[PDB]
Amino acid sequence: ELRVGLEESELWLRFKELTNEMIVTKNGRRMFPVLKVNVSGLDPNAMYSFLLDFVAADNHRWKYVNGEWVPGGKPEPQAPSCVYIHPDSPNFGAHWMKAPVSFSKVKLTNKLNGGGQIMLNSLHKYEPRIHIVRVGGPQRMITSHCFPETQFIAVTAYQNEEITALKIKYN
């Protein structure tokens, strides 16, 4: 049975309970904390790619008003984000199960850009999601997993200094 678990969930929970923020820049900014995923129950010999994308958690624009995040009143459809292919992809089940799969090199941007970077809408709330795609084999197969604990608002600068302080303390 394919088990997918969040590494350092205790750290992510400190961020979530303050409302997490991730910087987006024109050229793209790496994530802290990094999404790290513990995977077991793959076929050690089968061949898989690991994909990361970001679900808009709601259809609203958020704003930091009097020290608190509040949703706008005017929801718009949020298009699904583009997918980031983990650079170790494609790779054997054994490669993925031997250490946490770490998405340390994904860069979050607010502008349609060359390559690699994932474009997110500023002041939208996002839920990281992975897809494990069985490749090359006869039967293609996808398993998807969400990480509620890793939800964040995409921001061009930090609003809640409590987040700034946690980022610096643990980076």
Q: Are 126 and 152 spatial neighbours (Cβ–Cβ below 8 Å)?
A: yes
Q: Which residue, 83 or 119, is less far from ligand NZG as judged by CB?
A: 83
Q: Which residue, 29 or 134, is less far from ligand NZG as judged by CB?
A: 134
Indicate whether 46 belongs to the interface with ligand NZG (CB under 6 A).
no
Q: Which residue, 71 or 90, is less far from ligand NZG as judged by CB?
A: 90
Q: Which residue, 90 or 100, is less far from ligand NZG as judged by CB?
A: 90
Q: Are 131 and 53 spatial neighbours (Cβ–Cβ below 8 Å)?
A: yes
Q: In the stretch 97-126, what mask flags binding to ligand NZG with x, by CB under 6 A?
A: ------------------------------
List the beta bridge partners of residue 106. none
Structure tokens at 20: 């997490």
Residue choice 32, 90, 119, 167 for contact with ligand NZG (CB under 6 A)? 90
Indicate whether 82 belongs to the interface with ligand NZG (CB under 6 A).
no
Size of the site for ligand NZG (CB under 6 A): 7
E strands along 34-150, which residues? 36-40, 47-56, 62-65, 68-71, 84-85, 91-92, 101-102, 107-109, 118-119, 125-134, 141-146
Residue choice 6, 37, 133, 166 for contact with ligand NZG (CB under 6 A)? 133
Q: Are 152 and 166 spatial neighbours (Cβ–Cβ below 8 Å)?
A: no
Contact stretch for ligand NZG (CB under 6 A) within 64-72, 85-93, 104-112, 146-154: 85-93
Q: Are 116 and 27 spatial neighbours (Cβ–Cβ below 8 Å)?
A: no
Contacts of residue 24, Cβ cutoff 8 Å, sequence gap at least 6: 108, 109, 110, 120, 122, 154, 155, 156
Indicate whether 34 belongs to the interface with ligand NZG (CB under 6 A).
no
Contacts of residue 114, Cβ cutoff 8 Å, sequence gap at least 6: none
- Least separation in angstroms between CB 97 and ligand NZG: 17
User: Which residues are at the interface with ligand NZG (CB under 6 A)?
Assistant: 49, 51, 85, 89-90, 133, 135
